[model samples]
Target chain A: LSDEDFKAVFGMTRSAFANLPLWKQXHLKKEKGLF
Target chain B: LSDEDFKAVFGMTRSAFANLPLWKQXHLKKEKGLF
Candidate 1:
């Protein structure tokens, strides 16, 4: 799936993604193989 | 002044953010230095 798909699945906006707790961000990245 | 500020300024809820179109998402990340 593309990044767009990923965001859609997770309901994330740029602002909301930025505001997410660090751990949560890390978790999402990890799940998406972003890191 | 931070991610929280970003979210607040945009009035973005996680659910709403998730619904953004691909072009909007790309625009935000590029403009915001997210990538």
Candidate 2:
């Protein structure tokens, strides 16, 4: 998802997303169907 | 994590774990430091 889309959906900026645990990032990506 | 350990910690069998939303399962695993 685009950074804005991710922020809108997940309520976090790309920087915040990156700050999450790596596995959380991976899980979030899968949640968004990024892969 | 082992099946029993997962069950003990997450309070669900592997089958039940599999029944969760894919993202939830992945998140749970990460919460447990599985990877």
Candidate 3:
């Protein structure tokens, strides 16, 4: 997925994505199979 | 703790905190152990 797709699915801005609560962000990142 | 305390501990701005993923925010709230 692209950045826009990521944002649309996640409902977060670029900076907001990084600032999301750690556990949730980490969980999503893992769910996305990024790491 | 108050809102300021919550923000400081969580490192989130007010709006940013509200936009946090449901699971993690719920977890933190319950962990206060509010739940």
Candidate 4:
């Protein structure tokens, strides 16, 4: 996904998004149909 | 990271994990300090 897309989905920069747990990231992506 | 680590962290098989978008994959790895 693009930076804008990520920001819209996650409300954070890729760098900051990376700070979340893997399961959390997966859950969020699943919720957004990005997984 | 090993499959065990990925499974433990993500609670899913690598095959499922890889289904995620690249940015999410990178994010998970970054969170785990794997990237």
Off by over 4 Å in 2: B1-6, B11-26, B29-35
TM-score per prediction, in order, is 0.37, 0.50, 0.38, 0.46
**Lowest summed lDDT over 10 consecutive residues: which window, candidate 1 chain B?**
B22-31
The residue-by-residue lDDT of candidate 4 on A1-35, one tens digit each, is: 88788788888889887897666776777788884
Over the stretch B1-35, how does candidate 3's per-residue lDDT look in tens digits?
Answer: 68798777777776786787767676677566653
Report, for all candidates in order, the number of backbone clashes. Answer: 0, 0, 0, 0
Q: Residue B26's C-alpha lDDT in candidate 4? A: 69
- Tens digit of per-residue lDDT, candidate 4, span B1-35: 69897789877899998898876776667777765
The positional error of residue A31 in candidate 1, measured at the CA in angstroms, is 0.7
lDDT of 3 by residue, A1-35 (tens): 58989886677777888887677776677677777
TM-score of 2: 0.50
lDDT, model 3, position A1: 59
**Given candidate 3, what's the lDDT at residue B3?**
79
- Ranked candidates, highest TM-score first: 2, 4, 3, 1
Q: Give me the displacement of residue B19 in model 4, in angstroms.
A: 19
Error of 3 at B5 (Å): 24
B17 in model 2: Cα distance from truth in Å?
A: 8.6
- Residue A27's lDDT within candidate 2 is 70
lDDT of 2 at A24: 78
- In candidate 1, which residue pairs clash? none
Q: What is the lDDT of residue A17 in candidate 1?
A: 82
Candidate with the greatest TM-score versus the true structure: 2
User: DockQ of each model against the real complex?
Assistant: 0.03, 0.40, 0.15, 0.08
